[PDB]
Every structure is written in C-alpha cells, then in structure tokens.
Design a protein around this ligand. Sequence first.
Ligand SMILES: [Cl-]
Ligand SMILES: [Zn+2]
Ligand SMILES: [Zn+2]
Ligand SMILES: [Zn+2]
Ligand SMILES: [Zn+2]
Ligand SMILES: [Zn+2]
Lengths: 367, 367, 367, 367
Amino acid sequence: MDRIIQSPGKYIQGADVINRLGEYLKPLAERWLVVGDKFVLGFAQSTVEKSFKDAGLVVEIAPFGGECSQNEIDRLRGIAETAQCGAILGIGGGKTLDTAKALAHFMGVPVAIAPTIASTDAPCSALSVIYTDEGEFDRYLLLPNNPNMVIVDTKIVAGAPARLLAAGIGDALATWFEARACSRSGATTMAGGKCTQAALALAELCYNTLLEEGEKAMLAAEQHVVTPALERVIEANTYLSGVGFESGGLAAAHAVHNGLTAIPDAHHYYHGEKVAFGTLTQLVLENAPVEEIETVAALSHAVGLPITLAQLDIKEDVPAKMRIVAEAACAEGETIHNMPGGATPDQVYAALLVADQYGQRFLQEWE
Amino acid sequence: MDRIIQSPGKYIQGADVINRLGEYLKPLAERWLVVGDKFVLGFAQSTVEKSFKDAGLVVEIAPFGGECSQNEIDRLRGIAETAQCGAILGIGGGKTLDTAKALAHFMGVPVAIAPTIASTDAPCSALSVIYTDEGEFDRYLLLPNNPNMVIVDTKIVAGAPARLLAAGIGDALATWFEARACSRSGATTMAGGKCTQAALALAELCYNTLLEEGEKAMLAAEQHVVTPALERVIEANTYLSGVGFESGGLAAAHAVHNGLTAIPDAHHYYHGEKVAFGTLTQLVLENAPVEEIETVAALSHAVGLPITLAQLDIKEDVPAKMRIVAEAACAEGETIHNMPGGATPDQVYAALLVADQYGQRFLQEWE
Amino acid sequence: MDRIIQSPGKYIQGADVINRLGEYLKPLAERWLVVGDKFVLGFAQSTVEKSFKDAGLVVEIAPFGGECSQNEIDRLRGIAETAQCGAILGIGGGKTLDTAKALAHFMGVPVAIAPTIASTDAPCSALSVIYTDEGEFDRYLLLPNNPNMVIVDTKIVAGAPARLLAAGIGDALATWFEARACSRSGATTMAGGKCTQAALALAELCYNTLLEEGEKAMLAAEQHVVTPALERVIEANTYLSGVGFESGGLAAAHAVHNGLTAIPDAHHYYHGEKVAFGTLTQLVLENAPVEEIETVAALSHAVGLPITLAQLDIKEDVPAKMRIVAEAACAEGETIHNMPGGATPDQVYAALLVADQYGQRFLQEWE
Amino acid sequence: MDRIIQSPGKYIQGADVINRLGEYLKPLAERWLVVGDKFVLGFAQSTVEKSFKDAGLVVEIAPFGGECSQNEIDRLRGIAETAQCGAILGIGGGKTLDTAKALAHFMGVPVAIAPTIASTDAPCSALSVIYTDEGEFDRYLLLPNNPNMVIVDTKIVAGAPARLLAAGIGDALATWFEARACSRSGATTMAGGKCTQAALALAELCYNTLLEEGEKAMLAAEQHVVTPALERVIEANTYLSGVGFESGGLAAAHAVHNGLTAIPDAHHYYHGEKVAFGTLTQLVLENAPVEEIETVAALSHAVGLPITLAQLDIKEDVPAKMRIVAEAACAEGETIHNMPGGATPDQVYAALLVADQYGQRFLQEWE
Ligand SMILES: [Cl-]
Ligand SMILES: [Zn+2]
Ligand SMILES: [Zn+2]
Ligand SMILES: [Zn+2]
Ligand SMILES: [Zn+2]
Ligand SMILES: [Zn+2]
C-alpha cells in the first residue's frame, strides 16, 4: 500500500498574530468572508478589519449562528456570493472552524483557519462534522484537502480558560499511542495509506513535548500569559497532534471516546477529557508496560484530566454503562479494529474496568 | 517572531503509484494538463493515460521541451488554456517539475508534482527556478504555496542511475545541519518565520534516516529494485528534506554550493554532489566535533559523494578558485549569514581548504 | 550427567477454549472418560458434552469423588474399562487433575488436563499427589510422562476467586529462585538430569513475567475479566512455572513449604501462600542481596501474599514451631539439600526467623 | 486466538547417552523395534542391544532402507507387527527419524527419536516428510503429537563431520527471526495458534546461544570432542530451534529455502546452508538494522555458512533463477505471507539480489 501524509499548506503561530492576518492571507484572495461567533468578534473584529485594510483586502464579516448545520452553511454561502468573496476565514472554536472549512469546500475557494483555543486537534484536519440546525449528529464531510492556512494567536489562546488547554493536552496525548498501534498493525490512516516515517515522528514528538512541557505550559495558561512552554504545547495540541492523528492513525483511544458519548453521564466533559481516559483504556487493552501506564496517568493527573470513570461523572450503573461503551467502541467501522489483535467487546469491556481500577489506585497513592 | 511550517497538501509514495494517478488527482480537477519528461513519457505515457481515463478524467499530454524557460511556460500555457485544463501535473526530473509549478502559478490552478528521480529536495518546495531557452539562469519565482500534491513512484525511481539517488542523499544530508544552525542562530526560514518544533524533528529524522538506510538503499538502487530501505531514503530525500530545508533553514552548506558554481570546474556535477562538500565545509566552519565530521564524511564516501575538491574536478588554481567560492558564498543575501556569528569570506576560505584537507586524509585511510 | 527437559506434549490457552475441547482432543482418542467434581461439572458439563458431540466423539461423564486416593483411582479405572475409554479428561482443580493423570497412566491411555484455576504449577507436571481415603497425605506418585494436553480456559480462570490467582503467583514466584539455586549447586531435577538451558530460560521468564504483569493481572482478576496481562500470568503460573520447577529444580522454598504444613496453624492457607514465605526464607538462607529480597517482598505484598509468619496465622510460640518447620524442611529426601552447600536445621531455623523480621520491617515501612 | 506450544515429552542429551537408552525407554514399552541406518547400526547396534537387554527389554533390529517412503514404512510395519513391538526407536539421521515417527503413528505406539547428527531442527517436530521409493517428494504427514522422547548422544554427534553442525547452526539461526516475524504479524504457528511467551523465549534463547557459543562449538566439532559449548549448540540446534520454529512461527527464511530447492544449482548443499541465505534475505526484506544484518552475516561466515548466491553454486543466469526462487517462495500456502504486510514476488526478488550484494560486500571487507 501507498504511504501518504497530508498537512495544511501553511501553519503559522505567534503572539498577537491576528494583527498580521492581512499580510498572511493576501496571497490567497483579495475579498474574504470572515466567519466568527459574536463572542469572538467582540475582541477581534476591530483588529481583523484593521489588518485587512492596511493590507489592501476587502472583508465581509458574517456573525456565526453557533452551530455547524447545513442550513448555516447555506446561509453563509449566500452572504459570500453576494459580497463576492474569494476565500473564507473562520475564527473561533471548533464548530465555528468546521463551518468555515465546509463552506469553503462547497464554494471551491481556499480556507484560512484561526483557532482561538487549543483544545482539540481537529483544526488542521481535512474533516468537518456537520449537525442539524438543532444539534444532533448528521453526517461526516471528508474534505479533499486540509485547510490552506492555520493561524494560531498564542496570546488569544493564553486568554482562554486553562481547562481548555488541558483538554487539548488530553486530546494530543492519545496521538502517539494510536499512531504507534496503527503502525504495529498495518492499519490504514484517514489519509488513505500507511504511515510515513514523517507522521510517526511528529506523533512521537507530540507525546514527548507534552511530557516535557505540559506542566510548565499549564502554569502559564492558568496565569493567562505566553511562555515558550505554552508555545510548544500549542504547536503540539494543534499541528503535531493534527498531522499525527490524521496521517498516523486512530485506534482504541478514540473508539473509546465515541463509546463514552453513547451514554449520557459524561455530557458535561470536553472531547479531550474523554480521550484522556480512552488513552488509559487503550494502554490496558494493548498491555502497555507499567512504566508507560504510570507516565500517562501521572501526566493526565498533573494537568487535571480524568483518569477514572468517576471523574467523568460515571458513578452509578457502571457495569451496564461500560457494556454500552464497549459495544459502541467496537461498532462496525470504528477505529478500534486498528489495534493489533483487533478487539472484541468483551476485551474492551475488560480494559474499561481495569483502567478505571488503575486510575483509582493511582489517585489514592499519589495523594 | 512567528513560527511557520509549510508543506505540500498531500504527499503520496509507493511502487507503481503511477497506476493510481487518476484516483489520487480526481479530487482536484476534472481536466488535467500533463507536462511530461520525454524519456518518462516514452515508456509510461500509455499508463498515465489509462490511469486518467479509468478515473473519468480528461487529460491532455504535453511533452516537455527540456528547459524551464518563459517561452516553454507560455507555449504550455496555450495548450492548457485551449484544452480548458483546471490543474497541471508535472512528471519527470527537476526542470519538468519546476515548469509545472510555474505554469500552474501563472494560471492560478492547482499543481501535482510527480518526481521520477530522487536527486534533490526541490519537488516539495514552494520555489521554481526559471531560465533562458539555452539554460542560463534568469530569476527565482517564489510561489505563494507548496505543490498541492506530490506523488512519488518508487519503482520508477529505482530505475534511474544510482548516482542520482546518492546526489539526493548529499542534498538531504545537509538538511539537519543547516536547520540546526538556523535554530542556534534565530535565523528566518524560507517560510518566513522561526523554525517550528515540527520542522526540526523532520530535519533530524532526515539525517538519521540517511545514516541508518543510505547504504542499504544504494544497494537496491544499483539493482533497480525496491526495498524498505529505498522507500525510506526516497521519503527522506523528498518529503523530510524538502520540508526540513524550507521550514527549518538554510546556512553555509547551500551557500558553499552556490559559491562552487561561481567557477567552471565543477559544472558537470549534480547539485547534491556540490552540497555534499558544502556540508563538510559547514562542519569545519562551525567546528563540529571530530566524531560528527567523521560520520558525515564516512556516509558521504560510502554512497560515492565527493568529500574532496579533486572529486569535483577542482585540481588546479585551488587557492585562487577557493577565494572566488568564498567571496560568492558570502555575497549579500546569501544564506551563510544564518550561521551562528556569521561568516566572513576569510573564514569560509579557511573552512574550504581544511574540509578538503580533512577529506583527503580520510580517503588516505582508504575507508 | 545427562541434561533433561520434560514438557506436556501440547499446552493450549485461550478464552472460552472449553468450547473447542472436542476438536483439540479428537486426534488423540475417540472415546473419552471425563472426570470432574460436582461443582465443576455443574458449570462445564453442558458445554463439554456439546463440544464432544459436534466433533464426533463419545463422552462418558464420571463424577469425581473429591480425593486423589489409590482406591478412587481404582474405582475410576473400573468405570473406564466398562465404557471402553481411549483417553481421560480431568477438568476440575488440583485433586481432579492428579487423579486424571494417574488413572490415564495405569490405563495406558493419553490424558488431557483442563484446569479451572491457575493456583499451582502442578497441572503440567508428571506427578500425582496421593492421599488416603480419609484425606491424609500418603505418597508422591511419579509419572512416566507429562500430560498429553493441557487446556486452560482463561475466562473460566478469570471467574474464580482472585485469591487463587495470587496463590498461583506465589507458587510461580519461587520457580526462578529454586531453579537458579539448583543450577548453582549442580542438583538433579525431578526430570532426572541437570538443567537444560531451556528450563532455566523458562524459569527466569516466569519470574520476570510475574514482576511485569502480576499487579496488572490482579486488577483484571479482581474484576473477573480477561486482559493480556491476565493471559500472561496464567501461562506463567501454569506452563512456565511447571516446566521450570520440574525440569529446573526445587530447593529451600518448597522444603520450607512442606515444613510449614508440619504444624497446624497454617492449615487454612493455600499452597502458594506458604511457598511465598518459603521463597523469602530461601532468599535469606542463600543471602540474596537486599535489592532482590525487597523486590520479591514488594511483589508478594502487592498481590496479597504473606511475607510474615503472622500472615500465615503463626502467632503463638513461634520459636518452638519454627524448630519443627526447620527440622521438617531438612528431613531426608527433602529438596533443601539442593541449596549450594546444603542447609542444616539450625540454618533454616535462623533463616525463618530473620525472613520474618524482614517481612515485619517491610510492612511497618507503610505497606 | 489460542496460545499453543507443543513439545516432545522428554528431551535428553548427554555424552554416550545411547548406553542409557534402555533405562530411559523402559517405562514406555517392553518390546521395541529399532529402525536404523546400516552405517549407524554399524557402530551402534551392539551398544543398543546391550542397553535394552540389561534393562529387561526385548529389541528387534530393523535395518533401514534409506528412504522414508510409504513402501518402506509398510515394510517396517510388517516386521514390527510380527515381532509384536510396542514402540519404535529410530536412530540415525533425518530420514531414519521421519520414518520412525510415521511408522509409530500408523501403529499407534510411542516413538523414541535418537538423532546422530544435529543438522536440522526437524527431530523434535510433529511432522514427517514422505517420499517415493526413488526420492521424489510425496506428501507431508502432520502428526497428532511430537515424539515421546528425543535422545541426543553428544559424543556421537561430535564424531560427525563438522560441516553438519554448521548446517544445524544455519537452520537454528533462522528461528528467532521467523518467530519474531510471526509475533509482529499475529501469524498462526504450525502448532495451530498464536505465540506463547514460552516459545518466543526459546526462539530468542536459541539465537543468543548461537552468538555466544557458535564459534567455540565449531572448534570442538572440528576436533570431534565434547565441550560445554558444543552441548549448548546441540541443545540450540535440536530442542530450542525445534520448539521455536513449530510453536513460534515460520516466515520468509524458510519460504526462501523452499524457493532455492526449486532450482538445481544448490542440490549439493544442506537444508541449513540454504536457510542461512534465507535468513539474510528475510533481514533485507523486513529492513532489519545494519547491526543486525552484520551480526547474522558475521556469525554465518564464522561457521562457514554461505552468505552469497555463489557460495551455493548459484553463479549463472542469476536473475532468471532468482525469479523462480521468488515466485516459489510466494506460492500459495508458503510461510512468506506470515511476514508483516506480506511479501510480493517482486519484493522477494529484490531482497534476494540485495542480500546477495550485501554478502559479497561483506566477504571482500570483513574477510
Ligand atoms: Cl496537441
Ligand atoms: Zn481527538
Ligand atoms: Zn539543495
Ligand atoms: Zn547545480
Ligand atoms: Zn509448588
Ligand atoms: Zn529448517
């Protein structure tokens, strides 16, 4: 099979980089649609407009409905054709960014993505998740290519709630272990081939960056300031983790995340916070060595990620609920089948309970 | 400053991947111009055509004149506009690929790049070098983005003379040392910012891939067969080295290469062969440890790359010529100024003579 | 002297392997006597019968008396002769399996052994422990060969009380230290020769498997689920430990176990729980380094095995009782004479008291 | 699936152990057929007769036709039924032993196997290779169980030509690399399951034994004397390698051996001599690190095994012949499909030529 790696065309990261959006985006189009929800436009709209003006570009700002629905994409398509936009610039969190990527696809124009948080590794990916106007799952829209540009303002991200950075860390912490599993098993990545040497290097670089920089970065995030450690974790949460997961492979950790949403208890927890426990479950499933499990559990704990089912508010019908999680994780077409032996629901069920036990014993020892 | 990494959107590599050109390219355009190297088309045109047809695409094959001149670009522009092509596919050596990238830029269409040799790391880069019809240098054409897709057929590459693989190795062997030098000095990369963690990991991965796989890969190249060592060295010569140099930084090795072209003696040697000696000169200039010089020298010699001036046919007015090489390498806007502390023409002159001296003594131990 | 290793002809292990007894045993005989106690036949008879039926085999269920006595073997010999059995299948715990192996010997037929717990390393051995009709130890019965097949259902073993897995770990934890002692001293194994390289490799693998997988396997055991760590400790408790002790050697640890049954206080503790303290006694006796004593004590404690006399309910009049244990351990024909240099009852006495002190100081250091 | 390891019931090796056949074999049967090569009986028949007689056993000597054909098995079956033999003892080389094992199977009696050379790992296996009277291949006879006893007289083996010990080393050297390959890919062993930990430990112990003991053992082999190093290599060549391959897995090395017999040039070379080059081919195919390739090539050369096609007298029309070898090695039901990711005939062809290059380069350097 072919070895494939895909990447956004340009990834840019720096403090106060929105001031420089105009010069960065000019080579792609002269007239831009700028999609942002009201909260994000609150602090950035002044700066976006100034940057485009000084650069000689025309901007047409369109406040974002808040949900990534086919209706909202169609709605913005109208405004954009009316204002004769040559590209879309999405700015904000995950759903606002997915909307920009889907819109720019249907219109056949380039897209720029400016995350205002580093809480998932979705931004750089060639994937948009579409919902109905009212918020239920609808379809996956796999896109022909990754965002043309990704611009991350590290000062904006430092301003966000620290819990969102740690959720991002939890998301990126799975990257290495799922890419490694797909390499061991010969699985196909979401880029359509086997692992390049490049993708595995970026996946492992992700994990080591979190080990070396996570706690230092959280200190900065809690103070809402920018230090070089925060810079590195943002790159790891965003570019490394994005290319890592998409061109390196997904496996049990994310299948387990999907299983955890198939029950209501953990609705109030972020994507990356569920993956955190998914990674620990995968380590039990593949029987990672004790030193590796402890390292992942310690790092997760150090940044506030859950390492037990109770810390995801799953406290009541635990056997019954884990049986649902396990069946969901092993559903047809789920990525847990990329694990080396494959995985049966009985096996995933076992890992779920054991990972939970392991986390409980860890919390009572380390404090 | 901002940290920037740029990449082609999708990099694909595999044996006989030419059979799959059609499916890989369909998501980009329905109508394709193929700028093709005459030797490549000689044996492959039927196969390219069948690949496009089976995918439901219409293709217009255009044999390439051999030089990347404004005349040749204009001539191909006509053919493409007549045939109403939405994208350009270059397939062949460096000049074919540079022509496809320039053509696609002037037309404002996506471009796909299919190297049939792995002798430089230019294919993935956002740069095209334009000449006059008779091969004299004319100008640089910096492109706003990297090729949309790069597709490398390893079986086609294995057919080329092994000297071309080794030239590629010499080109890629410099990557780590120049990106590392730029990181030490805070220099700006060709992507316009400081180096990301990602680019440095790919640059160092490149170097280690060459150390571990170069001699094994050369064995396969000399038999024109495909082994996993060859696959990895092709990825290093192409994706790792391209992203490494462009987003990691250039320094003395390439500057010394340019200086070596300021004299006639080594005109008949490939780019990567002159870079090979540039890397040894940089190692003297930055006073790399002796183990490191020895490792780079041993690997270079093991794959037939020059490690002395005489092996580039520089045998006569060596001081006078090295004086020219040094002055040229230190010209304004040359990348030697990215070395920590910079480099004066007197310092580069000394490094040249000492590296040559070091290479000669290494050869005398018949290694 | 000759180097000899003995092994069962086939060892099979898996989840729900009970379903596959028929196809696994078909090549050995067509008509099978199945020996099982009422409790085991309770949950397993239905499944065994279906497995034999579907495979084209004849089964004869023979409920087991509960004691491995000469008279009980003779009784089953009669039942077997009547039903014209070509093979024996024992399926309960230890006494069931010993009875099946001896019966098959006197009958001159193959035997398959299906343990439903992994709590001792006897299953694979060419040995049956014989009692009187009223339950007193009578003699060891050496068999000419090891069981023809051993089939371990990992799901059945996961269902059993976790305390039994820990006893199995305690039993298997001694294997490396006693085989290593016999190798150092040149002692003869129960297989009749000196150590093969093979048996020493399997004994040390056993120890390292417990070291790496013991705590992970106990988490799965306490939840009655199957994880790859549990799979590994089952193989270690059963095959590795079995071939290790029989073809690797016994020494002080088992001598001390036998001595510990020469007093009533520890009647309520399993074989492996007493062996666990025997291993610590041997480590004091052979003056292992403190790192080795501590590693064994920590692993023992981490899975709930005793590392003090008090944890074997030996709390009253300890000096007098240890004298009896020591004298018993040094009886004629005991394996403590395999220690390098032998051991006197005074020496074993001192080792017992000091090992007890060591365990106590360890428990006082906060678990 | 299931973890399965199969083994002979008892493996014995020692100097002059044929003196002790009687006491070792008596517990299995009272009346023995001894199948023996005329040359082997030449020096051994008197000693065998005394050993069985002194032990109270009855023996019936049956000189062996030399070929393991159904006609010859039937001829010996007759003699055995007439003399009312309860078990078979084969004593000689490979054909004698395969004949004894098949005969014992058809008769449903135990078999004892006494190799007089240690040149393959077949003796301990549950497999017999049947030919026609005139030496052309007929069928494989998979046996329900491994030999009951294997007895290796190390002094008899020391008397054999040293080339045969080296052939045994070449055969045993592949064990680790093929078992490791099957473990990486989850292939099924010839024992019907996935790898036990035990079998991988024996396969790796085999490899390390050859590295540490191979050259010392060859010194003793050339003087026809017994040293502890020779004993360890015999155990490695016989028990470790046998259990390793059958319960650990076969892969490219043996597929490549089979392909090499598909051409006439190497008819005068022993099984293990061809396997030696098969291992090197596998190392190229799976892209083993150079240190590993060099270690295997160096050890192979140190004991006289071939590391080039010319050393197997394959010197003419080499590409044409290697294409035959490659196609044969990938035929349906060959073990090359156990390699991670499989291997196509083109990939094996490439490995063959490159491994040949590597061997040639090694011979002219490290001679
Ligand atoms: Cl035309
Ligand atoms: Zn995620
Ligand atoms: Zn270059
Ligand atoms: Zn050049
Ligand atoms: Zn025991
Ligand atoms: Zn073999």
